[model samples]
Target: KYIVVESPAKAKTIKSILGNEYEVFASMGHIIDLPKSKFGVDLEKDFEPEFAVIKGKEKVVEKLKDLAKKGELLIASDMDREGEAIAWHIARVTNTLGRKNRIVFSEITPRVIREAVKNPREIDMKKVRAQLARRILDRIVGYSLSPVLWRNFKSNLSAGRVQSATLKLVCDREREILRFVPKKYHRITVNFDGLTAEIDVKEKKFFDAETLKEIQSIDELVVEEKKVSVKKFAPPEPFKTSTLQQEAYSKLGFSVSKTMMIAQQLYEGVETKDGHIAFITYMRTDSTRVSDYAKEEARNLITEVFGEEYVGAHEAIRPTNVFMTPEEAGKYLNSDQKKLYELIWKRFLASQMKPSQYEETRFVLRTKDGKYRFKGTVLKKIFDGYEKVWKTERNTGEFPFEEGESVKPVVVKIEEQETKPKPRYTEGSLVKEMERLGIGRPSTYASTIKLLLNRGYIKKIRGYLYPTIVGSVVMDYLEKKYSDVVSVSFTAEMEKDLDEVEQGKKTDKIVLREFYESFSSVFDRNDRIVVDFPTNQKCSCGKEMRLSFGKYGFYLKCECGKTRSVKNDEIAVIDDGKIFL
Candidate 1:
């Protein structure tokens, strides 16, 4: 009974598969981090990182020690670098010093489990060191800047490597929005009986504010509606890396962290309708094309599930090769777990099933007073198609009309809407933008979001994202002070270097030095930034308020020892405060 797993939850999952013949236990995640109490980076010899088991992880280590005493061999922890680090920690902690006491599993299925248990290999020191270097760098960033955040902002807030960069990204986006100057534009609509189709105008359709205002003056202008038929739209080119983020944000309204969480659950395996368990392929992917084999499976499955008319005549829908040839190596997917293929499988099955047909109507009316136009389209479902499994009903505004019929436009209220600023970076959209900018990986997204929120650099508002004053200030300073570290090009370069380390082109230690050498100097230089707290006007206790910065936000500490918060230079208090913006 010599078995080991990555996490305690995973340990339970394996126990269910292996039974009492094997004694399985958990490594409780990666153990080593630089001291939480202080910054853990060696500025001297090539910025070498020191590793130690995190505080409170000692109990897991003790359990491993006891288990090693009973068993002659111990399987390794999970499969990735963090998993490798856990194995190294257990070996160091429990005296299971060799790779003989470790096992790595891609899946917990019975067949895979048996084969993996029968064979164990030596620990990959490269992976261990990679994990160590990353952890140490993270600790130095988190452990150092976090205290600054704690003292200056809220003590509870924390910061980190992936997080600081993430905050910088969000803050920068907000700045772009702030500086945006919206220009007014106008679109012309011409309607005919039964068809409200946007007249694919063959000119510069958009009008500037001056031109738009001039166009609005031509009231009696009667433009004839043209009937041009045959418009077809293919379902979006199968989900690409960008499309997934956009769709997830636009449709699901899921923050990047939440979407990734749900995706991980689906890919890692979940309980199904029956007692059986099903694991979807790796969900993190950028490709829009599936492999030949996966395409065949989907076609076969769709044919079996539906019928001949519903299936496409072609063997497979060949992608137009829109994406780059072979994207960067992502950790979440194995070879078989093709990222875009899973989304394609779900979508292709739906696309072939049926066409979401529609009956369109347009009405071009002319009168002595004015020439008015109205049009409408009725959605007529031809077949259930993929909607039976995965279709979202979208907003189709007020459809009512027949091909040759005309009636008074009942809802003729014209709406006035201004061009709006992009919404603040919610946790989800921030992640999407980050991915777009090639800033961080999917696995690192959630931690990055959590770090920004914890650092008081960013705040959430009604599911939207907003950069705090402090966040804005810090980013402005970092952008100027440590331009090399905070520059988009520099960070992206570091990420490439990290990949090089993984590929054995460079050492892990070398990759880390590239980041720290420049960052540490900038960090030291900017340590004394003076943030003057806004002066408070009044206190809740009927006393004149004085200015002071607290953890949450700027506040007024009263002479009566009563403190109250302020926003937009106005005191936030009870009805006693005057209402003003």
Candidate 2:
């Protein structure tokens, strides 16, 4: 029998298990795709894709075709829509439709593989059709709209169905900052004993010096009442694909792509001293569902390690084999791999544990007449549950101030404050936002961000994503011209439509038909689009040298054909100048 898988490493692991009687090969991913030489999607053919052998994968196809002629052929790829599509493609290339053989398993364990081999099923074409619809829809956008960008902007700049919408998010945020007007306000506070009080609900905003002085003249400050309660912080849910990405970004400082890469390595099967072993479940899943056996193992492990009282109410993410602890895996893994593995391992164990209990206290401080009041809440940890694994420090000690204690003022100061703009997106936060918005899928999140970075649409500086000038220009043009196509709502709607296609509720042709009709409308508009950035700095030719972006970086340009290099900080200076034509 012959079996084909996605990666060579997966093949290695399976080959060892399948033994010499069976022949296993790797497709090395899709062996065929739409050719890059032209727009391979036929618009008149109901969006039928003109797929050709991927440029360098000719030998893989030949090898797979050769193996198919010998005996029974089984396609064992991943268990996602993408994997289903891959298996379909391999079947088409090898002309194995007569066999109707496809096997799928979530984890690559010997038992699972053996069971999968015992029961082979036909390909789910609904999933294949869904993937096809997505591929064609993206091709329609990338091939059709990207040229419009090329015509307007510099060479080789491109857009996407999801990436363009994501770019709009960044650009909109930046614009919100640009138009923001900061208003000055005052915060009045008084200190007495160990407790502090602030000028409460009556009037907190002090616009001028007169109001500030009036409040500072208050003589007496007294505590009116106090409130105390206990609270519990439940352990976080098990890691989904997006949450895992976010946690790895926040805690381990791994890039979105880097985290996925490490996860894929773990999923594909890591090398242990005993043999090759699959470390985690499928990494690209939205479901937080854990197997019963895994949960029972976790319960047993938790009982052994932390005691019964520390057991949690819910099961979280855990290793397929609970015995493969981080310390054990560390013997076979590298530093980065070990760190990420431990993170997953600990987070999983912590999820199946109890909530952290805390004793919370709130103090309300007020003046004698109850005119000024301030409230403070203190949290003290009573018990550490899952927190033992995922630790957060709590401020420990007793409340120093009593409910009715009178206090003297050390000093009361009026300080000016301004509202700050919302912070920029980091890789972690961006992924979470993307998932929240339904802008992309678990499989596409890393690629979406990585593509934006590759195209110079955004830059990651000190862990924050800031749009480049070209990125802003492209977004502005798309929003103004193709508003419907690059809209967040439209993109998210398309994702839902694709989901329907996968569910067999809608056909791929119908979905693509609706999208193409809407997307094609942008081509009808022929107005000349000119993108200009106004600046205060005058050119040597007496015209304004406006801010502009080029292939390399930002520059200030003049109508007279003069250009000067501008730094990242200089872009801010131009914004401050507020010059417009």
Highest TM-score: which candidate? 2
Q: Residue 321 in candidate 1 has what lDDT? A: 22
lDDT of 2 at 467: 79
Report the poorest 10 consecutive residues by lDDT, candidate 1: 571-580
Question: RMSD for each model, in Å, please?
Answer: 9.5, 3.9
Instruction: Give lDDT tens digits, candidate 2, residues 1-581.
Output: 99999899899888877888788888878898887858888888898788888889999999988888887789999888988899888888888864668987777778778888878888889999999888888877777666666766663334378888787776666667767887667877666544455556654464556756766776565656767788898887778789989999999999999999998888788877778988777788887777777788888998998899987711233476777899998888889888888988888888889999999877777767765576656677889998998877765555666778776654676788886778888989889888989997888899989988877778888998877756666666677678887799999999999999999999999999998888786654344545557766798778877776665556778879668885433223113324322
> Scored by Cα lDDT, where does model 2 land?
0.78
Highest-lDDT candidate: 2
Candidates' lDDT values, in order?
Answer: 0.53, 0.78
Q: Name the regions of candidate 1 deviating beyond 4 angstroms.
A: 28-32, 54-59, 62-78, 92-106, 111-122, 147-159, 197-299, 308-417, 532-581
Candidate 1 lDDT score relative to the true structure: 0.53
